[PDB]
Ligand binder design. Structure first.
Ligand SMILES: Nc1nc(Cl)nc2c1ncn2Cc1cc(OCC(F)F)cc(OC(F)F)c1
Ligand SMILES: [Mg+2]
Ligand SMILES: [Zn+2]
Length: 338
């Protein structure tokens, strides 16, 4: 309501893909998730759906943003604000608007907010090797991913002031809870190709099969029938949260490079700790003393991004994102200079 001018100007073109997320981070003083959350949740009408007040939402975005570590270069509140922004953008697109229901939009925006809450700047395999409290707690299986979702609901419902789900109906909340959990757990690295293969096989290929006829009225309702099913909506939710999470290579060049440094700094810090404590080196290529960030980003984009966003683009139609993916890939290539 009474947003200050810097933070208000920083959130001018939040609908657009081109959005200065670090200016918002600088404006908010490492509090971008609360300000960007309030606008987006209001723009979608999330507390109107959930039957929470505006005051319950402020308290909710505060306690979650508090649990995001400022010391983490990449995995902090500004990363979640970025992922929240990419999620909303995908929800706003026509394909996703005319496929998913209102409950899915709420699950997506809530999932994006919480998906890395209380991240220790360290990977799952580091915690499993180190014998961490959470690695013992989740039995070396989806350690971070389960901790995020679990804690996110411990903070939400456990206190009355933070509980945005308090006024819901038990049947609706049970669906929404299950949907959020699935979207948060779908971000795990080890399940990458399972969720990509499932998306292409059940959405892209059958949608491509249905375009053999073209744009018939009986055929369009069949295309509506098949995609909108409970199972196929879950797959689009898994694909949207996976794309939004790792959308930084599809950003404007400056933000791509800033996100590239942060995640790289974070892996160097782990690697420096791994050799210090006598741990086995899980990500040996990511050492500050041997890692080429431009070459490493090309490999990252080759392995994870190019097939995933191609599959996603064909579904949603993302000319701006894929043109950035071409420009950013070409920039990383051009930094060899040897
Ligand atoms: N630009 C970036 N470069 C690097 Cl190397 N990692 C980045 C990054 N942006 C986000 N990350 C996190 C990340 C995401 C990832 O895919 C997540 C999915 F599979 F769930 C796999 C990763 O392993 C390996 F590439 F390091 C790391
Ligand atoms: Mg994560
Ligand atoms: Zn993440």
């Amino acid at each position: 309501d009474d947003v200050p001018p810097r933070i208000a100007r920083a959130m001018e073109n939040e609908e657009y893909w081109d959005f200065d997320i670090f200016e918002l981070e600088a404006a908010t003083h490492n509090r971008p998730l609360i300000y960007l959350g309030l606008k987006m949740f209001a723009r979608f009408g999330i507390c109107e759906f959930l039957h929470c007040s505006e005051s319950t939402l402020r308290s909710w975005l505060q306690i979650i943003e508090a649990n995001y570590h400022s010391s983490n270069p990449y995995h902090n509140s500004t990363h979640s604000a970025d992922v929240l922004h990419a999620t909303a953008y995908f929800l706003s697109k026509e394909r996703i608007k005319e496929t998913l229901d209102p409950i899915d939009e709420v699950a997506a925006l809530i999932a994006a907010t919480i998906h890395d809450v209380d991240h220790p700047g360290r990977t799952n395999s580091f915690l499993c090797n180190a014998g961490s409290e959470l690695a013992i707690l989740y039995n070396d299986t989806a350690v971070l991913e389960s901790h995020h979702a679990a804690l996110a609901f411990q903070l939400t419902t456990g206190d009355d002031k933070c509980n945005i789900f308090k006024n819901m109906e038990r049947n609706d909340y049970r669906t929404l809870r299950q949907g959020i959990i699935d979207m948060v757990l779908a971000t795990e690295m080890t399940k990458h190709f399972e969720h990509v293969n499932k998306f292409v096989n059940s959405i892209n290929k059958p949608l491509a099969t249905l375009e053999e006829n073209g744009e018939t009225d009986k055929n369009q309702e069949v295309i509506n029938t098949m995609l909108r099913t409970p199972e196929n909506r879950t797959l689009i939710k898994r694909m949207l949260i996976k794309c939004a999470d790792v959308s930084n290579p599809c950003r404007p060049l400056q933000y791509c490079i800033e996100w590239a440094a942060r995640i790289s700094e974070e892996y160097f810090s782990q690697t420096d700790e791994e050799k210090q404590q006598g741990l086995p080196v899980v990500m040996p290529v990511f050492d500050r003393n041997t890692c080429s960030i431009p070459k490493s980003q090309i490999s990252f984009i080759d392995y994870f991004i190019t097939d995933m966003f191609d599959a996603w683009d064909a579904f949603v139609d993302l000319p701006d994102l894929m043109q950035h993916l071409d420009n950013n890939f070409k920039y990383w290539k051009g930094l060899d200079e040897m």
